[PDB]
Amino acid sequence: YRAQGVKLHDKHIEIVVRQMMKYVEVTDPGDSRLLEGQVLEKWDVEALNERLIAEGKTPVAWKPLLMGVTKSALSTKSWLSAASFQNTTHVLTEAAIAGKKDELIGLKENVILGRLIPAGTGSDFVRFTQVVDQKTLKAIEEA
């Protein structure tokens, strides 16, 4: 981009690279039911590892993994977004067998169902804000 004169902040590229490095590969199952060589999200194994330490068990040993944007997108936890992207037959056949439950976390899943996307005015941070004047509030405070 620089060689072409395009100016782009490094944040946008680092957001995508963060998604590429989102997964890890298990090398030692430890005191868990995970399989050696199984690929899962880095957040899950770290959360599982800190959990295993809590009850005094051998933590899961993992290895950082890098995959492309297509592979990272297709191996997402939500089957609705993955099915709408590509390999619809392959995504749906695995999700149906695994009985995968889509929690509707991202934007594509909510768009498919026509729901309010969890971003912007639809985010839980601002969605529940209330507005009231100093007279409709003062009267309520009395009660």
Binding site: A96, G99, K100, E103, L113
Partner: protein, 55 residues
């Protein structure tokens, strides 16, 4: 209530039969002359419901 999760799973023959309102036994779609759906066909009104509301 409100939809929070969507789940996909294999459908058993018992579930497929529970979904169905009737077995489609004939390939006939509609009558060629009267243009009404044929009984037990792919467009059967006893299976999939009335063509027009409350009739």
């Amino acid at each position: 209530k409100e939809v929070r999760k969507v789940r996909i799973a294999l459908a058993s023959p018992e579930k497929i039969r529970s979904w169905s309102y009737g077995e489609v036994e004939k390939p006939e779609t509609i009558n060629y002359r009267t243009l009404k759906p044929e009984r037990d066909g792919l467009f059967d009104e006893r299976i999939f419901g009335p063509i027009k509301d409350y009739e």
